[PDB]
Each structure stands twice: as structure tokens, then as C-alpha cells.
Design an enzyme around this catalytic site. Structure first.
Site, PDB file in Angstrom:
ATOM      1  CG  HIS A   1      -5.714  -8.400   1.958  1.00  0.00           C
ATOM      2  ND1 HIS A   1      -5.998  -8.625   0.625  1.00  0.00           N
ATOM      3  CD2 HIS A   1      -5.286  -7.120   2.040  1.00  0.00           C
ATOM      4  CE1 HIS A   1      -5.772  -7.523  -0.060  1.00  0.00           C
ATOM      5  NE2 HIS A   1      -5.336  -6.595   0.776  1.00  0.00           N
TER       6      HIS A   1
ATOM      7  NE  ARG B   1      -3.042  -2.515   3.004  1.00  0.00           N
ATOM      8  CZ  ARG B   1      -2.540  -3.701   3.373  1.00  0.00           C
ATOM      9  NH1 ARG B   1      -1.262  -3.836   3.685  1.00  0.00           N
ATOM     10  NH2 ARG B   1      -3.328  -4.779   3.434  1.00  0.00           N
TER      11      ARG B   1
ATOM     12  CE  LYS C   1       1.774   2.087  17.124  1.00  0.00           C
ATOM     13  NZ  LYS C   1       2.629   2.975  17.929  1.00  0.00           N
TER      14      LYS C   1
ATOM     15  CG  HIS D   1      -7.893  -0.055  -5.025  1.00  0.00           C
ATOM     16  ND1 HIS D   1      -8.536  -0.818  -5.973  1.00  0.00           N
ATOM     17  CD2 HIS D   1      -8.380  -0.450  -3.828  1.00  0.00           C
ATOM     18  CE1 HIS D   1      -9.392  -1.630  -5.382  1.00  0.00           C
ATOM     19  NE2 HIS D   1      -9.310  -1.432  -4.078  1.00  0.00           N
TER      20      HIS D   1
ATOM     21  CE1 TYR E   1      -7.587  -5.012  -1.948  1.00  0.00           C
ATOM     22  CE2 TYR E   1      -6.720  -3.596  -3.707  1.00  0.00           C
ATOM     23  CZ  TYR E   1      -7.186  -3.769  -2.395  1.00  0.00           C
ATOM     24  OH  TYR E   1      -7.237  -2.706  -1.538  1.00  0.00           O
TER      25      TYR E   1
ATOM     26  NE  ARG F   1      -3.668  -2.580  -2.545  1.00  0.00           N
ATOM     27  CZ  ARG F   1      -3.485  -1.267  -2.569  1.00  0.00           C
ATOM     28  NH1 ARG F   1      -2.282  -0.732  -2.767  1.00  0.00           N
ATOM     29  NH2 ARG F   1      -4.538  -0.479  -2.372  1.00  0.00           N
TER      30      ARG F   1
END
Length: 280
Positions: A252, A133, A158, A226, A261, A229
Site C-alpha cells: 500500500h 490481492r 501494471k 477483501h 484493513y 485480507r
């Protein structure tokens, strides 16, 4: 008779300012439509239309481009006669929106457009080859890269959603040339990619660059991280990579996300079908 229909058709096209060339084509195509229907335009039924489309595609072996040109000609002809356009000419379409991604060829063009620019090139390569990302890329530290092992360590700000990603050979070379430069810079930080002010990038600036690079490559589709990806995860799938693995790589927690995706396009889906078709 049918001449009188063609004659008003021409008069209308003349009025709309088309070329002689276009008219001659449209006319010829509509003439074959009438000839095949052999009945008055207002009398033409949906099944008639389906017979005519089969006529074009099967009997006359038209390409799709030619099929579409004929269909466009007949519609315009209906419009010219102030008649109702048979609804079957236009008809209800291949499914509406699900997000769109790049062709394997568009990717090449996207990357290559950036070879002029060592930093851009290394940036694009990482997103295209690793599936990370924007944001994760921004917070990459120089020490997270391990060229020799073709691995980037991706750690969190985080939640600790930590993982490694794997780079392809060409991405290892791309970053490699960038790190040569990066290493000689007298920066107050150890971030991997740095702006012209030699500081960490802003997530927004990266998206701009990806966007612009997509134009610079002559890509009609709007290119964003996006999309890249979606492109990458789809390629891995087309290349035999299992969904759960792709999930690992993208980082994920649930496959429902990884599904987004890996939504395949029509071409891809047909290939994947041929390749794994039911055997009976």
C-alpha cells in the site's frame, strides 16, 4: 392487579402460539420486573429502566444472554399491553457498520474446509497468509514462488507496484503440494494457479470459490478476498506488527489504505487496550 397484567400477557402469548415453556419463562421474568419496579407499567421512567438493568446485571448477576431474554420478555409485555415500550430497553447501539472480518478460529475453519482440494487449499493459504490481492494471485508465475526462501515475488500488470510477500510455514507446505501437481501438467502457460481448462484463472472465479468455501465451512459472515485480507492484516497487528510494516507487506502506497484493513473489532480492541493500557 399485576395478576391482571400477567394474565393478559399470557393470553397474548397464547394467541401468538408460543410454547407453555416459553410463556412460563416470559411470565416469570416480567413478574420480577413488576416486582422490582413496584409501579404501574405506564408510569415507568427511563431512570427506572436503568435501575432495572443494573438490577439484572449487578444484583442478580445475569449473563448477557439472560439480560437480553428478560429485556425481550418485558418488551413483548409492553407490546401485549398496547403500551409504549420504554425507549431505554432497546437503546442506541454499539456503533453501526464498519467492515467485518474473520475470527482467528473462522480462518482455521476456512482453510481446513479446503484441505480436500490441493489447489483450493494452496489458493486459500496464499491469500490468508500473504495478503495478496485476487488478481495478483491470478497473475502469479510459477517462477515467482520461492519455497525454500518462503517468498513470493509479486510483479505488475501494471504501474510497477512490485514487492515480495512472505509465506508462513503452513502456506509453504500448501503451495508445495500444489506445485507438485502443477509441475506435471502439460499446460501452454507457466502461471502458478490454473483452472480446469489449465489456463490462468479469472479474478471472478476465484471470488466464487472463496465465497463457496466460506459456506462449505459454515461461516455466517460472507467471505471474500477483501475480508480475508482484513483478517490477515488485523492478525499481524494483533501480533505486534507495526502499521508501516503491514503497509509494506500489503503493498500500500498510503497508510490510509492500510488503515482500512487494520480496523479492529471490539474484542480485539479491548485486548489491545489491556495489553498496552496507559500506566498510571
Amino acid at each position: 392487579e399485576t395478576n391482571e397484567y400477567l394474565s393478559r400477557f399470557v393470553e397474548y402469548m397464547t394467541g401468538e402460539r408460543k410454547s407453555r415453556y416459553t410463556i412460563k419463562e416470559y411470565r416469570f421474568l416480567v413478574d420480577q420486573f413488576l416486582s422490582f419496579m413496584n409501579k404501574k407499567p405506564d408510569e415507568i421512567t427511563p431512570m427506572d429502566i436503568e435501575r432495572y438493568k443494573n438490577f439484572l446485571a449487578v444484583k442478580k448477576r445475569y449473563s448477557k444472554t439472560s439480560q437480553y431474554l428478560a429485556i425481550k420478555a418485558v418488551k413483548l409485555f409492553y407490546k401485549a399491553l398496547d403500551l409504549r415500550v420504554p425507549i431505554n430497553l432497546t437503546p442506541p447501539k454499539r456503533p453501526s457498520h464498519m467492515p467485518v472480518y474473520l475470527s482467528e478460529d473462522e480462518a482455521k475453519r476456512l482453510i481446513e474446509a479446503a484441505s480436500s482440494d490441493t489447489r483450493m487449499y494452496a489458493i486459500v493459504s496464499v491469500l490468508a497468509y500473504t495478503g495478496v490481492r485476487v488478481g495478483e494471485l491470478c497473475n502469479l508465475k510459477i517462477s515467482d514462488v520461492d519455497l525454500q526462501e518462503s517468498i513470493i515475488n509479486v510483479r505488475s500488470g501494471k504501474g510497477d507496484k512490485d514487492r515480495i510477500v512472505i509465506m508462513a510455514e503452513e502456506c509453504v507446505k500448501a503451495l508445495g503440494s500444489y506445485l507438485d501437481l502443477r509441475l506435471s501438467m502439460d499446460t501452454d502457460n507457466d502461471y502458478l494457479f490454473v483452472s480446469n481448462r489449465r489456463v490462468r484463472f479469472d479474478t471472478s472465479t476465484i471470488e466464487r470459490m472463496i465465497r463457496d468455501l466460506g459456506k462449505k465451512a459454515g461461516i455466517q459472515k460472507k467471505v471474500t478476498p477483501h475480508v480475508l485480507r482484513h483478517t490477515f492484516a488485523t492478525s499481524v497487528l494483533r501480533n505486534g506488527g507495526d502499521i508501516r510494516f503491514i503497509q509494506q507487506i500489503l503493498g500500500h502506497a498510503s497508510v490510509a489504505t492500510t488503515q482500512i484493513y487494520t480496523h479492529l473489532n471490539d474484542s480485539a480492541l479491548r485486548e489491545m487496550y489491556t495489553q498496552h493500557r496507559p500506566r498510571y
